Symmetry: C5
Subunit: 307 residues, 5 copies
């Protein structure tokens, strides 16, 4: 076979779509193999720019097609390079930009912990005709973490493994496995903005909903509860426009549902408290002293849902 | 004719547009037929990469154009392969990405049951010059269902049928039918997020609207009803921004309309209850005891609209 | 001249932009003319696939360029076909997708009645060098009307006419008219969702605004009117986000403006009713009995604005 | 030099981005110059379709590149024509679509008065090698003004002028000026929808804010003022979603800010009126009679801000 | 090596994405070097238009590839020029449009101070084979600052420096540094619209929240506080839709959080004031006199958070 050493450069990672489970990675790719010696002009290596590689391909020069497994569509390939040493080795350099898919679980959304995965595999040649010797990833673009959405933790890991296809055994007897390169890039979401702007006003609004039990008029308590329900609906629509469109509930959504249930339970308990009277002589005071038990129950519910 | 065996690979399915009735499917397509024997270099099969297929086409090699019937525009074709065995058989491999249309009914929106349909047909050659022998679809990319919007149920089905065009009989006497391949992929929408975040707060808000009959002041009942109407408008706009823009009402929209009607009926009944007095001496109490009949009537209306 | 018979296929129509007055039409186009006889290989007709038409064009084969007059930019041309009979006739087949402009009036928005117009004209050749014999449009893709936004009524009409350009008389003495094909496709908007979700809650909210006159406290009437005004603002923003961005008011916008005016008139009349007293002894009762005349006046205003 | 007569056709103008200061213009461009005589086949002029112009360019035919100065990126060039008379003159025809930038001031937004400017200049040849003789613009596509966003007033004006570059004097001694064509197209925004749907409900809401002084309870006046403030916030968010994202305030924004200030001043004056009492015996009546001076002051403020 | 003089023209700068940290720059690039003398037709320099440069490249003419380091994908290259003097010097001119990344800190969002950075470096040739002599940037397009989002302050600065790559030492012994050109363009955000439409109504709403302490009824104070909380939620959602989606809080977000905390503290203090009574005989008056200390405390908090 032919040994190919791959170097992958990463510039900057963006375009995370939560519903589509795609993210955009921009950077360079460097591929280097060894071929037959050629007589280049001069002792210096010969270099071929963009839109001149096709002339050498039509001449008969052998270059492989290293596609990305998890990319959708085609990557936006920029400038391409093809530098030919006279002693035999060929270095291929190109710049790409594409949307890459992954599993990308989003439970515990403000405190996410997910990895960006890049997969590389030759589109044409199998293990017996093309191998990957080693890959050194270059995630050198590391800057201050305070103004970035994603916190890159540690250094990216690389692995080389063989992938066997079951459907290639129909026409190919013993050569049906392909060399694949997988690169994992760990990242942690920045939780400062979400914690400061979403979690804390939920706590303040939920405490405001707890505040309704300190009143003395039943009808005015009902109107206060309906105003609190409208406030919770308004904050729910405020969160849902800014939060992404992932197909399952987060901690914020569970907090919103728990607040809805708390308002409904408050309405039911004050209605039951006003109409516990035998003949209208009893006061709604004995069961109305849940002002120091209802927030403790909600805190217990919160501690249950976190764990 | 020429027999062609087609293999269709599916990577991941996304981009469902409810108004446009389109969805995006990414994957590979493999086409294999048999031709005249050729003298390739060596006993190994000859393989042709991307942007070199056109040279063989200009040379005189016969390849067909297998278009997708239901795609809009043109698919984003990635890397293409053309591998030539010396004993005669030709294998064509390509990767595509495009938006495919379907019927895609969206009634009962949180509990959808719809199929993704891929259609394949040669753009040029009819039944007497090109046939499809068989197709084996490979929907092997199956993962955990908990973090996906669509639940792939079962295995995708394939069918080969002939489609006859009426307009081709003007110039073609007896050869006017085309071999078509149709692939059905069943899917079920994930209902957990919608049921937890939309259906339940509608029930809580509708119960809060039922709660207005437990008051004792007519004017305060009117103000409570207007506050409840504003709350229902707020939740309606909260749902309509997050719910898709399908051109007909769902179960959630019917629930919202029923809540609007319930508030209007509550307003009309309390107005009629206050002004049923002959000379202002009667109390609004006899007809106001619909507090345990109005929710039962709404539940009956709901049971009617579900069935 | 050369006679050309055009067949236009329509797949599905979507992408209606109300502000841009554009819509997207996908389908096929078939052009057929007659040329000099040629010696094709065998008695069977010779067929040319995609990206091989240019070789025959460079050889000297005459094909025209049939552009769309009302399209913006360039259509997304898919696979193209070029089939050469040996007795002389040439059949050209292609698939397109583009955004087509029209007048597209949107007054009476929920009950629209507008036509989709496709225009075809040769980009290069005039009447003396190219003619259109006839066109048969194929709008065969007709399905159930219940789940579609647009109701296709009847069958599409076709017309062939000559268009004369005034600016071509500077260099061309007597040949300045071009053969043009115009295809009209009638369509009616689906009014069920709009009528169920927008018109009816406007009626309910306007009746709720009528309900304010049944109170007995002037200050509480003012607060009720301000709450109703906030509700109408909320529903106005609910409609304006979902309704399109056409540059003029619809029936829904006129209803919203009339509701605003009704609330303002209610506020002015109750203010005048409270302060019609000579020395504070009169009751606001005689002029406050417009509870059964104000809705009739609003219904008269509605009947005026519909007609 | 070589004289070139340019004809510019305009189809329809759309895509106005207020923040980006770009607009989309679709139409044709016709360029005509005179060259050496050639022997075309027959006495009829020879015509070259799309994707065959490059063959004549490679042969040695001289065509210039007429770029647009104010376009961003590249225009979406459709079909191109190249018609060669045998007596010498060459006519070049092409269709374009691109986004053109301008100054495009947006102060007095509902009553805008701005011009669309198209600039043309050869990309390669200066005044001594290429000149523009004259341009006749064809804005013939004029229709009814009632259903269009922009009112085209008058006929478009054209001007031919020379533009001198300072940086070209380093290598070019006396030939550093370029012939430029500038076309001005005047347009007026349609004010009917904005005046009916935004300005009038602002007046109604501001009158509703004026209505708070007619009450008799200080606390109820405060609650009414807070409800009016919430209504003004709701209408502000209703306007800001539909109004464009221009980086400075319009008349509507100034009206909204003035309404905010009016509510704040009303709150401050009623607070001062309640607490002007020496020992709680005075009534808030003498300074509370600004009910017929505060709207006059707001009208004076409005008349100041308009002028 | 070969000396290359670069001239960069800037047309207009737009498309600032706060989350993606990208901005769009349109303009020209001019590259000039010196090569071997050639015999052009005539004493005039020979000029090569678009889509004819590739013929000279295939002939053997040496042109470099000057890529942008910080661009994502590929720039939208418009018309390209290649003008060949007969005495030896080559001038290359091209027009580009692309999205360029930067650090682009957004703290103190209404009063931003950030620089637009353009980086240029040859994609292929190192310092020993290609050098940049000097660059003169032309930011001549300066207009009135009143109608622009970004205020260009001063003149753009240019710098030429060498960038050494560590990974190129594996195959290249002593030639591993690349000549890079960096251009800084300073800009200041326009603060007039933000200050007039966001900061001032926050102050008015916060003063309205301060106004709640002037009441005399505890329950009515609670309802006023809940209405103020709903108003603050409404204004928060009004700001968050118009403000960008940067991943950290701005001054406006800190003001909103401080207003939430002020409302919660007001609720807690009035609840504590009503229930400081030993047996219900005390009045909530002594601690309720924080009406002239709570705004001073909030102003102190604001002065702390600004500094
Ligand atoms: Na009240
Ligand atoms: Na709202
Ligand atoms: Na929105
Ligand atoms: Na909204
Ligand atoms: Na309220
Ligand atoms: Na509200």
């Amino acid at each position: 076979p032919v040994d190919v050493s791959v170097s992958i450069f990463i510039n900057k990672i963006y375009g995370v779509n939560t519903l589509e489970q795609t993210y955009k990675v921009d950077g360079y790719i460097v591929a280097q193999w060894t071929g037959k010696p050629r007589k280049t002009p001069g002792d210096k290596p010969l270099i071929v720019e963009n839109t001149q590689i096709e002339r050498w391909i039509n001449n008969g020069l052998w270059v492989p097609a290293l596609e990305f497994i998890n990319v959708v569509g085609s990557p936006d390939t920029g400038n391409k390079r093809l530098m030919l040493f006279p002693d035999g080795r060929v270095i291929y350099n190109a710049r790409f930009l594409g949307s890459f898919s992954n599993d990308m679980d989003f439970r515990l959304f403000p405190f996410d912990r997910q990895q960006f995965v890049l997969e590389l595999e030759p589109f044409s040649y199998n293990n017996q005709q093309l191998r990957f010797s080693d890959i050194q990833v270059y995630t050198e673009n590391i800057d201050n973490e305070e103004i970035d959405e994603w916190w890159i933790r540690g250094k990216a890991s690389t692995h080389i493994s063989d992938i066997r296809y079951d459907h290639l055994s129909s026409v190919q007897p013993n050569q049906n496995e392909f060399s694949r390169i997988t690169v994992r890039i760990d990242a942690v979401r920045n939780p400062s903005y979400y914690l400061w702007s979403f979690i804390l006003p939920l706590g303040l609004i939920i405490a405001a909903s707890w505040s309704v039990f300190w009143l003395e008029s039943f009808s005015e308590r009902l109107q206060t509860s309906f105003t609190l329900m409208l406030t919770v609906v308004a904050y729910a629509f405020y969160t849902s426009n800014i939060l992404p469109r992932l197909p399952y509930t987060t901690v914020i959504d569970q907090m919103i549902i728990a607040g809805y249930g708390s308002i409904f339970a408050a309405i039911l308990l004050i209605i039951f408290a006003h109409h516990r009277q035998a003949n209208g002589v009893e006061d709604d005071l004995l069961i109305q002293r849940c002002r120091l038990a209802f927030p403790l129950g909600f805190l217990a519910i919160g501690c249950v849902l976190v764990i």
